Design a protein around this ligand. Structure first.
Ligand SMILES: O=P(O)(O)O[C@H]1[C@H](OP(=O)(O)O)[C@@H](OP(=O)(O)O)[C@H](OP(=O)(O)O)[C@@H](OP(=O)(O)O)[C@H]1OP(=O)(O)O
Ligand SMILES: [Cl-]
Length: 216
């Protein structure tokens, strides 16, 4: 069990590959059925790097709400490809879940998601919104961003990547709520997230491992 999770922890993938989306490996979603109520009418799972753990996590997240999820692979040039789902159905309250490995540890934990600083990520997402909305003729923006990478906010939840990111997103014209984890993070086969607690056990719904940043 813990074997599966440490193997799937979303930190420090050895080979960073975020360039040229056409060269990325595909994903296949296996829709699952036990994931009950979601407040989002639709969501985009944004795969930020070509890594097998990241690809698997993105597919698993999609499978939890297969009918209303779109998976996009998004590269360093801002080119993307829709690898799962129907962008034209995205309506109502939307979430984006960003999937990638956190890297480059500091006193406030990881400083990079899929090779991007908080500010670079915000720029990439703002360009992505513009490009996607015009290519797919959608006009919807997220209400929430869930950061699906390991340890991207400080242990005390006051500093780090998540804070720089929510502020940078707003400075780029996207005011959104952001959920982000201070612990190691992994996604199971049902698309549920598990975090590593203080003892070192992989656990579910540990609120001390997550913070939800908001414009109150
Ligand atoms: O309702 P549940 O089955 O317990 O699932 C929740 C819910 O996700 P769904 O949209 O899939 O229902 C949360 O979404 P919120 O409305 O709270 O945002 C999500 O939180 P994030 O959006 O922050 O990712 C949370 O994830 P976590 O385990 O980090 O709380 C996740 O629970 P699962 O991990 O069990 O899917
Ligand atoms: Cl709500």
């Amino acid at each position: 069990e813990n074997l599966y999770f440490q193997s799937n922890a979303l930190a420090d993938g050895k080979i960073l590959h975020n360039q040229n989306v056409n060269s990325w490996g595909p994903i296949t979603v296996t829709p699952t059925t036990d994931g009950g109520e979601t407040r989002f009418d639709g969501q985009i799972i944004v795969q930020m790097e070509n890594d097998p753990v990241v690809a698997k996590a993105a597919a698993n997240l999609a499978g939890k709400h297969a009918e209303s999820s779109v998976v996009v692979q998004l590269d360093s040039d801002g080119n993307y490809r829709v690898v799962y789902g129907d962008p034209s159905k995205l309506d109502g309250k939307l979430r984006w879940q960003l999937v990638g490995h956190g890297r480059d540890h500091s006193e406030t934990n990881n400083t990079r998601l899929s090779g991007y600083s908080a500010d670079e990520l915000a720029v990439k997402l703002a360009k992505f919104q513009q490009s996607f909305n015009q290519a797919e003729n959608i006009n919807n923006k997220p209400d929430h961003i869930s950061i699906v990478g390991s340890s991207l906010v400080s242990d005390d939840k006051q500093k780090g990547f998540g804070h720089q990111f929510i502020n940078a997103m707003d400075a780029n014209g996207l005011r959104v709520d952001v959920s982000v984890r201070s612990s190691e993070l992994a996604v199971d086969e049902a698309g549920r997230k598990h975090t590593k607690d203080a003892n070192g056990d992989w656990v579910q719904k540990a609120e001390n491992n997550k913070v939800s940043l908001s414009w109150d």
